[PDB]
Amino acid sequence: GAMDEVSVIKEGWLHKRGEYIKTWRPRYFLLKSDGSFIGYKERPEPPLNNFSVAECQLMKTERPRPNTFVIRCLQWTTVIERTFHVDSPDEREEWMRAIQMVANSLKKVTMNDFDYLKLLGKGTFGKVILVREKATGRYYAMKILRKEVIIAKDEVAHTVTESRVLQRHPFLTALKYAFQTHDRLCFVMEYANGGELFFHLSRERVFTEERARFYGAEIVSALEYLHSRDVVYRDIKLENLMLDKDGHIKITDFGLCKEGISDGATMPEYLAPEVLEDNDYGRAVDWWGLGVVMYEMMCGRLPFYRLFELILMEEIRFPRTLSPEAKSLLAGLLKKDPKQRLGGGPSDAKEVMEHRFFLSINWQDVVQKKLLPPFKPQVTSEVD
Ligand SMILES: CCCN1C(=O)COc2nc(-c3ccc([C@]4(N)C[C@](C)(O)C4)cc3)c(-c3ccccc3)cc21
């Protein structure tokens, strides 16, 4: 009940694998009556982990570590795994039963309607395939998860209704539909047909500030919307940015991979300093991400063209040809301390929107998709 005090169901030490730096560390966990699963560095006598076990899927495994268990949940259209280890099979069973008990207490379109044309991405949890709806001839990206990912029928129905309720957010790939077969969960989403921004930057080598400002503005707008609904994108990078047919930005939702890395040696991804430090991270990682993308757009290369050390300790250098305002924007977005970073304060995207670099931007025209694009992608077929 909501009026009742939140109470501890089960508590104790667990070994947990890091989210981004995939290394084992001992943590003290409290499973709460409201579904919070809260992790501290030491036993309380400021939590480092806090997520919900509501709607989760629990699995036993013996490899790599014996007495390992995985809490898997679906976050929007993306599988999130959290991996834990205890010292015996009996201890694991007690944890799994506790977690499951708490999760229990809180409780036509087919695949033959599509032509399957081309692979768009793959990863450990499934694949994204370019599809054509047969009856309409309209193209979509179908993100198909592997059979191992079991999700409840009420949870998929919730995501479909919640996608429909939110229909102004023009620069995100909209979820069109989601459905289950006998075995698999499929998400039908919009496909941007203007190509990869990674490709366009490679083709052109570098963008002008004007063009970079245009794409930056659209990203800033998209991030303002997500952050206003308490959503961190986490993966702002060139590979996750596409253009639609008109040349406007689409941020993608094609994640199928496990997050993170074994250690700092095996990274090239520019994770936020606070992520690398293994600290409290939040919405400020997206402003870092924007910093790195805009640096790439305007300079034609990543900041450190040893990367763990360089991100933590070394200052990002600017070409002399960058304007003072561009230099200032990038310096602000690439501050190592997320409290000092442009966008890291209470006003969030407003700080970025008010920066000298963006003074020519009409932000009403941005969100209404009314700023005219400086580049129109060449008109391709959908398969090409
Ligand atoms: C508020 C608008 C609707 N909406 C919700 O209601 C609930 O949460 C949402 N989450 C995401 C979203 C999607 C992937 C990510 C990731 N990179 C981080 C990750 C590992 O989880 C994949 C992070 C967040 C999105 C989204 C969809 C398309 C493009 C960008 C973001 C939309 C919503």
Author numbering: -1 to 43, 50 to 111, 146 to 205, 208 to 307, 314 to 351, 357 to 435
Paper text:
The serine/threonine protein kinase AKT plays a pivotal role within the PI3K pathway in regulating cellular proliferation and apoptotic cellular functions, and AKT hyper-activation via gene amplification and/or mutation has been implicated in multiple human malignancies. Allosteric inhibitors induce a conformational change through binding to the pleckstrin homology (PH) domain, thus preventing localisation of AKT to the plasma membrane and therefore inhibiting activation of the pathway.
We present the discovery and development of ALM301, a novel, allosteric, sub-type selective inhibitor of AKT1/2. The allosteric binding mode of this series was confirmed via a high resolution (2.32 Å) co-crystal structure obtained with a close analogue of ALM301 (compound 3) in complex with AKT2. The crystal structure showed compound 3 binding to a DFG-out conformation of AKT2, restricting access to the ATP binding site. The bicyclic moiety of ALM301 was predicted to stack against Trp80 with the carbonyl group close to the Arg209 sidechain but not forming a direct hydrogen bond. The unsubstituted phenyl ring occupies the hydrophobic pocked under the DFG loop that would be occupied by Phe294 when the protein adopts a DFG-in conformation. The docked pose places the para-substituted phenyl pointing towards the catalytic subunit, with the polar substituents both forming interactions with the protein; the basic nitrogen forms a salt bridge with Asp275, and the hydroxyl a hydrogen bond with the Glu299 sidechain. ALM301 binds in an allosteric pocket created by the combined movement of the PH domain and the catalytic domain, resulting in a DFG out conformation. Incubating ALM301 with increasing concentrations of ATP had no effect on the biochemical IC50 value versus AKT1, confirming that the mode of binding for ALM301 is allosteric and independent of ATP concentration.
